[PDB]
Structures are given as C-alpha cells and as structure tokens.
C-alpha cells in the first residue's frame, strides 16, 4: 500500500481503539486522551518520513500508487511540493490542538477525541487527493463534524455559531460544485493530469471563475462575508478554533493553486482587479473593526481576516514571489493564530471565564511567562522581522504591487494597522495599569502544559523566520508551474 494512505488510516485506527478499549475494562478518560495523542504523534512521524523522501524538483506526483482498477469515484493520493507543507502543518498542529485542550473538555471526552481524529483524516485528505471532485468531497466532509464540535463543546452562543459556519460553508461550496461539474463534463474527468492539459475557452473560464471565486470569497473569508467566522472561530472550543483557523482557512489558499491558476489563467488575469479591490477593502475594513472589538477571542478571529486578504492578493499576482509568499504567510498564520487562540480562548478564558477586554489589565505583574509568549505572538501577528509572518507579508505584498501597484500600496497599509491592533490588545491585557481590580484572587502563571505548546508554536515561527529556505526549496520548482506568461526573447525557442 502507498505511504500516503498510512497518513489516512492511522487516525482511523485511533478512532477504533478509543471505541474498543472500554470493552476490555469503566475505563479512565486519561487513557482515552493518551491514545488519541499518541496516534497524532505517529501521523507526524510518518509525515516527516514522507518529507525526507520527497524530491524538491520533480514535476511528477510522488508517493502515488498505480490503481489501474477504474471506477466512478476512486481515491488518488499524490504529494507535490506545492501541497507537502500544508500536510506537514496539519500534522504538527493537531497534537498541539489536543494538548491545548487537555483539561478543558471535561465531558463527552470520547466524542471530542473521535471528532478531532476524524477531522485530521479529512483535512489530510484534502491536500493529498489528485482530483478536483475528490478535492470538493473532502473540502466539505469536514462540515458535519464541525457542526457537532461547536454545539457539543462550544460556548454560550454555540448554536447560532454552528448554524452560521455550516450554512455559509454549505452555500458557498455549492457554487464551486457547479463549476467543478462543468469542468468534468467538458473534459470527462477531474484527475489533475488531464485537466492541466486542457485549456477552456475564455467565456467558459470567465464563468468557471464565477463559481470558484464565490466559494473562496465565502471561505477566505472577505469582509462582506465573514460573519460566520466571527461566530464560529469564537464560540468553538479551543481545539476547534485551532483547526478552524490554522488548517480549515487554508483549504481555499491551496485550492487556488489547483482550481484557478493552472486551468483558468485568462480569467484570473483579466479579473484580478476585482479580486484586488475586494482584498484591499478587507485589509482596511477588517483592520478598522479589529481596533474596536471588546471580545479578546473575537479580536484574534478578526485578525485572521486581514491576514487572509494579503495571501489572497499574493496568489493572484502571477509572480513567483507573491505565490511563495502566500504559502509562507499561510503557514505563518497557522502557527501564530494558533498561539493567540491559545492565549485568548485557552488561558484567560480558563482563568477568568470571560473574554471581555474590560476585565483585564496588567497581567505582566502576576504572569510574566504568559506575557513573554503573548508579546512574541503579538509581534508576529504584527508582521515583525525574524518571524515567518514577516517574510510571508513581504513577498505577498511585493507581488501584489508588481501586478497592480495601487492595490499593493493600500494592502501595505496592513503594515501600519496590523501593528496598531496587535500592540493595543497586548498593551491593554499585559500592560496598561496594574493587575486589574476585577480579579478578586490571584491567577497562577502558565502551567507546564501551557508553556510547552506556546513554546513549541513560537519556536516554529522564529526558526522558520530566520531560515525560510526550509520551506522555500520545495516550493520553487512546483510553484514555477502555476505562473502564466512569456517574455519576448525567452519564449518559443528553436
């Protein structure tokens, strides 16, 4: 069997073991948690084995298994240098997601672990499948377990929040389905190798673009459309919020390198000015309203909207630099947003039971270790050099500017306004007076669990910010096949 199926089967084996141990024993919930965490370690172990054996400049799909037994819907699993790092991020994030929420679930612990083990399978799949109809199948199988992850383990406004993400993500995904169905009917299949050969007529590509973009604007999400995220990324449990922002948000970032860039190039080129206008607006309106947010977890959720706009504008630049910067900023947001939900929804909400920023002040005086990590995370969210977030923004903004110079200049306002929301939140909670008077008793500082998941996540952000070539070497050759263009003395050689 292929080694890419081993990534899928392990979480499946782990769900089986959680449901069949109580039959060998009133077993403790501690042993439920250990099995799920070990089984996400193994996926990470395997995924690094896949990465050692990867070939950084091969234009054929790798780790493929020859099926030669065709059906109507067959799983085809290939790994490519444009998808490898999305897989690695998934497998590094899911253990922290489990450890972060280790004592906070308290009830329905089996069901909680079985959903996350299910989620890791489906999100691993969406990066590994070699069809665009297969891509859609897994891109939307994550929807039922997320409706239940929010309504069982979510906060007060959990019911409306779970309806919002499900219904918005269902609606937006059904316009992508109509366009995928058109592509398949014209071409006969949705297997990548046969689609990338095929070139659609301009008018068809103009109508496939309207349909793949409706979906991804719903799933970025852009400003006019993000009302599900400000509910779902907040009412959800801590572990739900980590997966939703780090991994689920990137399903459409990686889905533009497959669905738009190679098969609808003329449409992408001629409509970019519409994308850039939308992207510029969500860099401003989201930045303006991230200043006035009184919910700490909601402030982090709103930050993701402004970040996602920068990478969306990068993936539409037709430049090798904005394309790699978009993947780097997708990865960068993955580690940093994870840490700030760990700070907001998993530490202050553990100790105070509230998310209102009015009750917090001067937390440096009694939690110095929280303050140190909270400040480093806050500076990466502000796009400060030495973090992977700065590199992703620099390259994303450069390509946005080289393609359409006016929108990149309005996108670069982020540099100013991301810094203004990030420092203002940090100053209000850690600094900004003395330990607040609403704290009747003292609050303990970080536990050894809270320290080491923040430390792990922060370490990824810095070392990748110093040596981004750890991720750039795989991207260069594979990214070099989604650029559309020619130069006069370099093309059509004889």
């Amino acid at each position: 069997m292929s080694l890419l199926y081993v990534l899928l089967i392990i979480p499946i084996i782990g769900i089986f073991l959680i449901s069949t141990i109580d039959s060998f024993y009133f077993f403790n919930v501690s042993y439920y948690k250990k099995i799920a965490l070990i089984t996400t370690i193994l996926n990470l172990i395997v995924s690094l084995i896949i990465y050692i054996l990867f070939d950084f400049s091969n234009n054929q799909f790798q780790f493929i298994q020859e099926n030669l037994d065709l059906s109507f819907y067959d799983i085809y699993l290939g790994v490519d240098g444009v998808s490898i790092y999305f897989v690695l991020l998934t497998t590094i994030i899911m253990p922290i997601a489990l450890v972060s929420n280790w004592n906070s679930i308290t009830n329905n612990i089996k069901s909680y672990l079985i959903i996350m083990l299910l989620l890791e399978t489906l999100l691993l799949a969406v990066f590994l499948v070699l069809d665009v109809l297969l891509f859609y199948i897994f891109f939307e199988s994550i929807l039922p377990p997320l409706f239940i992850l929010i309504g069982l383990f979510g906060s007060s406004n959990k019911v409306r929040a779970s309806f919002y993400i499900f219904l918005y993500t269902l609606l937006g995904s059904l316009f992508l389905l109509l366009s995928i169905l058109t592509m398949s009917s014209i071409v006969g299949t949705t297997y990548f190798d046969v689609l990338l050969k095929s070139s659609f007529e301009y008018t068809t590509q103009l109508f496939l673009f309207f349909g793949i973009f409706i979906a991804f604007a719903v799933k970025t999400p852009v400003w006019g459309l993000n009302s599900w995220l400000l509910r779902a990324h907040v009412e959800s449990p801590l572990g739900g919020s980590i997966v939703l922002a780090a991994i689920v948000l990137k399903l459409s970032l990686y889905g533009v390198f497959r669905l738009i860039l190679p098969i609808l190039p003329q449409a992408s080129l001629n409509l970019t000015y519409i994308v850039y206008a939308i992207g510029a607006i969500t860099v401003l309106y989201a930045s303006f309203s991230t200043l006035r947010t009184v919910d700490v977890k909601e402030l982090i959720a709103y930050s993701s909207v402004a970040h996602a706009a920068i990478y969306l504008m990068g993936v539409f630049s037709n430049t090798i630099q904005g394309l790699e910067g978009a993947i780097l900023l997708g990865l960068a947001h993955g580690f940093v947003s994870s840490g700030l939900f760990i700070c907001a929804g998993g530490i202050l909400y553990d100790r105070t039971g509230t998310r209102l920023i009015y009750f917090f002040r001067g937390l440096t005086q009694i939690m110095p270790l929280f303050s140190l990590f909270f400040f480093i995370l806050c500076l990466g969210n502000a796009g400060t050099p030495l973090t992977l977030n700065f590199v992703g923004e620099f390259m994303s903004l450069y390509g946005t500017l080289e393609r359409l110079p006016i929108a990149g200049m309005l996108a670069s306002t982020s540099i100013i306004f991301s810094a203004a929301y990030s420092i203002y939140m940090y100053n209000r909670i850690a600094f900004g007076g003395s330990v607040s008077l609403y704290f009747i008793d003292c609050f303990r500082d970080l536990t050894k669990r809270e320290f080491f998941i923040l430390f792990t996540l922060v370490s990824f952000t810095v070392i990748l910010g110093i040596y981004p070539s750890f991720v750039l070497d795989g991207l260069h050759y594979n990214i070099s096949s989604v650029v559309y263009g020619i130069e006069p003395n370099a093309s059509y050689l004889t």
């Binding site: 303006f288 309203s289 050099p385 450069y398 080289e402």
Partner: protein, 670 residues
C-alpha cells in the same frame, strides 16, 4: 572579530533576560556591561583596521530569503561609513550601561532593564553592518521594538503605555513607506544588496529614483522625527533617563539619517530628493527650536534639542555634503548624551522631579553637573573650538556656500534656529543652577546650620552628587565634547580627504561645495552665528535675572499669552493629529463594527433571510387546514394554472412573475 562585534551584545542580553534568576542583579549587570565593553574595544580596533587602511570587510553566513532574483544574505559589510557609526553607538552604549548601574539601583527590575539595553545595542549593530536593505530593516524594526520596550519599562504607568504606542505606530508609519520603497528597488533592479543598488544607480530611470528617494525619505523622517512624523520623540521621555540618553537622543534617531548617508550613491541621482531633504531639515530646526524654548520640563527641552540637531543633519544631506552630516552625527551623540546624563543627575539629586519651575540654586550642591552640562551647552550652541563648532557651523556656512536661493533661505532659517537654540540653553543653565532657589526647602538644607535636635542623624537630603558609576560617564563624555571635533575634523571634513573612497559617501561632482564654502563665503556670514550667540546670551541672562519683569508682561499680555501657548503646545500638532487623524480612525472602526458588521451586513443577509423566511413559511403553513373541501379546491386551482400555462403558450417569464409575486404576498401578514 567583525562577526564577534555583532554577537557579543546579543549574548549578554540572553543571559540577563532569560537567565536573570540565575545570575542575579549584580551578575546581570557585570555580564551585560562587560560584554558591551568588550564589543567597544573590538570596534575601536575595527576603525583603525577598516577606515585607516581602506580595507572593507565582507562576510556572508547563509541565505535569508532565496527566491528567483531575490537572494538576501544574512551578511555583513564593514566599510568607512560603518565604522564611523559604531564608535558613537558602542561608546555611548558602553557608558550608559555603566551609568545605569547606579541610576536604576533602587528599581525592582534590573535584569530586565539591562537586558533591553544589550538588546538595543545588538539591533543598531545589525542596522549599520548589513549587506542589503532588507537586513538593514531587521535592525530598523529591532530598534523600534527595543524603544517600545523601554519607553514602557514601567508598564504600570498609563502615561508610559500611551507614549510607547505612539513611538511604535509613528515609527510603523515610516516602516510602511520604507517597505514600499524597498519594493521599488526589487521591482526595478531585482536585488537589494547595497553593491548592486549603487553599481547600477547612475543608469536607472530618473523617475524611479524619485519613487525610491521619496520613500526612503518618508521612512527616514519617522525615525529622525522631522517636522511631520516627530510627535513620538518628545513622548519617549517617559522611559527612564538612561534610555533617553542612548536610544531616544543619541542612537535610534540616527537610523533615519544613516539611511540617507548609506543610500547616498543612489539618492544623489535625484535633485528632487536632495532639494526635498534640504527644506525638511531646515523646517525642523526652527520648528523644534521654538518649542524647546517654551517647555517646563528638562527632558522635553533636551528631547526637542535632539530634534533640532537632527533637522540640521538632514539639511546637510539635502545640501549633498554627506561627510559633513556624518561629522555632525558622531559629534552630536557626545554632547547630547552628556546633557541627558547631566540632566539625569539633577533629576535624581532632588526627588525625581523634572520641572524647571521648582529647580533653583543647585549650582553649589551639584558642582560637577553644572560644569559638564555647561561643557555640553557650549558645544550644543557650537561655541568656537568646541566639538560642535567644527560640525554645526560648517553646515551653516556650507548652506550659504551653495549659492542658490534655497541655500540662502535655509541659512537664514537655520540661523534663526541657532539663536533660539542658544536661548533655551540659557534657560536650562540659568533655572537649574544659576537661579534663585525655587523648589522645596529640603532640597537645600545642609548640615552646617543646625536645624534639628533629636533627628540630626537623618532628615537632611541636601541634593547630594552621585557615586562613581554616575560620574565616570559624565566626565568621560565631557572629555569627548571638547576635543573630539578638532581631532577628527580631517577624517570627515578635510579638503580633499579620501576616508570615504569606497563609495560609502558618494558625492556627485555636479553638486560639490567644499571649495566655495572654503573660499567664497564672506567673513561676516562665516562668523555670524558667533555674534548672535554672544549677543543673545548676555541678553537672555539679563532678562532672566537683571530685569525679571519684562517676560511676565509678555506672558500676561494677551498677545503673548497666545504666542506662548502656541509653542508650549508644540504647534498644536498633537491636538490636530489626535483629534482629526487618530480619533477619525477609531470612529471609522466603530461605524464599520456597528452600522455594517452588526447591521446592514446581517440585516441584508443571514438575519434578514431568517426573519423573512420564517414569516413566509408560517403564512404558507397557515394554508394547510386539514379540510378536504379546501384541499380539493387547491388541486383544481393548481390544475387550472397548468392548463392555462401549457395551452396559451404563455411566456415563461409570465409564470415567474406570478410565482415571485405570490411569495411576496406570503411574506406580508394579515
């Protein structure tokens, strides 16, 4: 060695910051101080090694960003301009650490303070030793973080929090423009290594230099607090005094100027950027000389005096005489840091009070401070044969030397800046030392006269001078403030000197003014600042002491009540920015949050659709009555419409109008 200069300040910071528990307060102080001391000798050596032998040093360690055409190395280049910058940076860092062993002695948190000091030194080293513009930007941002961490060191003071947000976001404004300008260089030349940018600049499209130059100018003035983005330098005086000495008035403000001296082999190829730098420099010298004359705080005056000298240096850059501004830059860090350290001593000697109105006498109590501070004021005003005379007054005469209108205008303008500089420097030395005592009596009670009987052992506090760690810097910094101008005036000014012959400071032969400034200027304008300084000084002393009634007639005239409050309020700039710019953004954010996100976006969307559809379906289900008689009529009605539709050959659109019109009537109740 060269890569060891970079690493030592970094290593000491790590021990003091994440290991302050293990070494303690004294252990941190020794390691932080000694490690920075060692780096300073290594850089004194590097000055003779690189500059005095014309041997630039290159090192490259590994890649930072490796995309096609974009390869930025974690690399360093030591040249003539580099080693000039390090000497003030490393000495002033070395001495301010030693100063701080006694200034912060009572503070609870010394391991954190001394760590931030080492961290700040590392970032200036990175800023002036990078190969490319992008690694320059690591220190540029790094010193920005270090400034925020030190203006907000006492994070329990809300005032300190406000001033650190102001330092951060005003500097992040120039960061946006500096990044935009850095995107122009990559777009135009593919790379942003210094060697590439300068080897290629003479042939680049003139209009592209005017894009890069105006971006590197807007970013530079944010850090150098020029007339527009300067609001933060005054507010930085919230952080402790030794931070103001190193970061806010001797090293960080310099990064704005260093960007232009470094980018000289490029921005000489645009007369626009040079004629823009010229005026931006001249406006700030007068803009900040008037404000400082009207402040009641020692540090707000000395901060506004820093701003005036910075405006002089950018004046020199626009004048295209880069080596002159590199001279004023190195010189200023000596007599400026001396004032803060000197004025730091007077604040500590009393009660940590800072107001001029409550300081007086204190010349006898603080004998060393007054002399050293007057050592500094004599060079700050560029009294003849001081370290300032060989730099500050050469810009004035080289301004008139460039026989153009703009040159003459900025001479006149900067000359007025000089006269108001001499004026507030009298205000500092007279009020604090030479004035009638103005503060409380405990500042002054000695032990000679016996004012006590049963408590004579304690309760005097007669404003004592500081200890060894406080005075040894001041005396050393003062020894610089005297001899340093004359000793290096050939390295930098000369007449045909070849120190910067590695193209570190490229001057285009179509701009040079040294020969004219040496010979063309008449003796009157060559000497004029000396006359004004010697004239208004005795006038100012006379008004402040001999005739102490004229100023109050001015303050209590209505005409003077308004001119006074216009300058004390800093040209009302803060008032206008805070009300029109800052508070506009907060209300825009509120309008988007309330009216749209929680409003029309939800009314024209999920909440509107929810409200409409539920009403729609309640009405339709009000039809279903379980009356067979009514159901039969509905089936016949639905039968007739089918026959009408598919026998009249009605337009399909006619049907949808009916269907859509029906749905709306079910939306309406009653």
């Amino acid at each position: 060695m060269y890569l060891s200069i970079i690493i030592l300040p970094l290593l000491g910071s790590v021990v003091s910051g994440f290991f302050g528990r293990k070494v303690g307060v004294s252990g941190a102080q020794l390691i932080t101080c000694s490690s920075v001391i060692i780096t300073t000798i290594l850089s004194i050596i590097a000055f003779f090694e690189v500059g005095f032998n014309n041997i630039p040093v290159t090192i490259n360690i590994f890649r930072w960003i490796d995309s096609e055409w974009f390869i930025i190395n974690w690399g360093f280049q030591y040249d003539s301009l580099t080693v000039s910058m390090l000497i003030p940076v490393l000495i002033i860092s070395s001495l301010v650490h030693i100063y701080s062993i006694s200034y912060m002695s009572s503070d609870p948190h010394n391991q954190r303070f001394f760590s931030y000091l080492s961290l700040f030194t590392f970032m200036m080293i990175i800023l002036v030793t990078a190969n490319n513009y992008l690694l320059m930007f690591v220190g540029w941002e790094g010193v920005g973080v270090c400034s925020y961490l030190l203006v907000s060191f006492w994070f329990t003071r809300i005032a300190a929090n406000q001033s650190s947000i102001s330092a951060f976001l005003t500097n992040r404004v120039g960061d946006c423009f500096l990044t935009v300008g850095m995107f122009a260089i990559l777009w135009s030349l593919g790379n942003l290594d210094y060697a590439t940018v300068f080897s290629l600049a003479p042939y680049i499209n003139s209009n592209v230099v005017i894009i890069i130059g105006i971006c590197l100018l807007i970013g530079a003035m944010a850090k150098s607090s020029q007339v527009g983005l300067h609001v933060w330098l005054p507010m930085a005086m919230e952080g402790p005094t030794p931070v103001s000495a190193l970061i806010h008035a001797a090293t960080m403000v310099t990064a704005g100027v260093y960007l232009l001296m470094r980018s000289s082999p490029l921005i000489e190829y645009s007369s626009t950027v040079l004629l823009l730098c010229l005026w931006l420099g001249a406006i700030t010298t007068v803009f900040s000389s008037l404000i400082g004359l009207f402040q009641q705080d020692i540090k707000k005056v000395i901060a506004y005096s820093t701003m005036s000298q910075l405006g002089m240096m950018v004046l020199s850059i626009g004048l295209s005489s880069y080596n002159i501004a590199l001279f004023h830059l190195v010189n200023h860090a000596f007599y400026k840091a001396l004032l803060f350290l000197g004025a730091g001593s007077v604040i500590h000697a009393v009660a940590d009070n800072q107001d001029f109105r409550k300081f007086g006498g204190l010349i006898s109590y603080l004998p060393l401070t007054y002399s050293v501070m007057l050592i500094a004021s004599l060079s700050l005003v560029a009294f003849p044969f001081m370290t300032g005379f060989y730099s500050k007054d050469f810009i004035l005469e080289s301004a008139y030397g460039q026989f153009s209108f703009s040159g003459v205008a900025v001479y006149i303008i900067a000359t007025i800046g000089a006269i108001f500089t001499t004026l507030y420097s009298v205000k500092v030395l007279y009020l604090t030392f030479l004035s009638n005592p103005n503060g409380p009596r405990t500042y002054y009670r000695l032990a000679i006269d016996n004012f006590f009987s049963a408590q004579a052992i304690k309760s005097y506090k007669p404003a004592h001078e500081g200890d060894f760690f406080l005075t040894l810097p001041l005396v050393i910094l003062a020894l610089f403030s005297i001899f340093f101008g004359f000793i290096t005036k050939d390295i930098f000014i000369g007449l045909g000197s070849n120190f910067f012959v590695d193209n570190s400071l490229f001057i285009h032969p179509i701009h040079e003014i040294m020969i004219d400034t040496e010979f063309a200027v008449p003796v009157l304008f060559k000497l004029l600042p000396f006359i004004f300084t010697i004239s208004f000084s005795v006038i100012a002393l006379t008004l402040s002491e001999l005739l102490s009634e004229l100023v109050i007639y001015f303050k209590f005239s209505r005409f003077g009540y308004n001119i006074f409050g216009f300058f004390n309020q800093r040209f009302l700039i803060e008032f206008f920015y805070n009300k029109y710019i800052t508070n506009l953004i907060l209300n825009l954010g509120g309008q988007i949050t309330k009216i749209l996100d929680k409003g029309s976006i939800e009314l024209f969307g999920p909440y509107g659709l929810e409200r409409g559809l539920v009403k729609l379906s309640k009405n339709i289900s009000s039809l279903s009555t379980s009356h067979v008689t009514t159901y039969a009529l509905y089936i016949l009605v639905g039968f007739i419409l089918y026959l009408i539709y598919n026998n009249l050959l009605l337009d399909y659109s006619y049907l949808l109008l009916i269907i859509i019109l029906l749905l709306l009537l079910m939306m309406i109740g009653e």
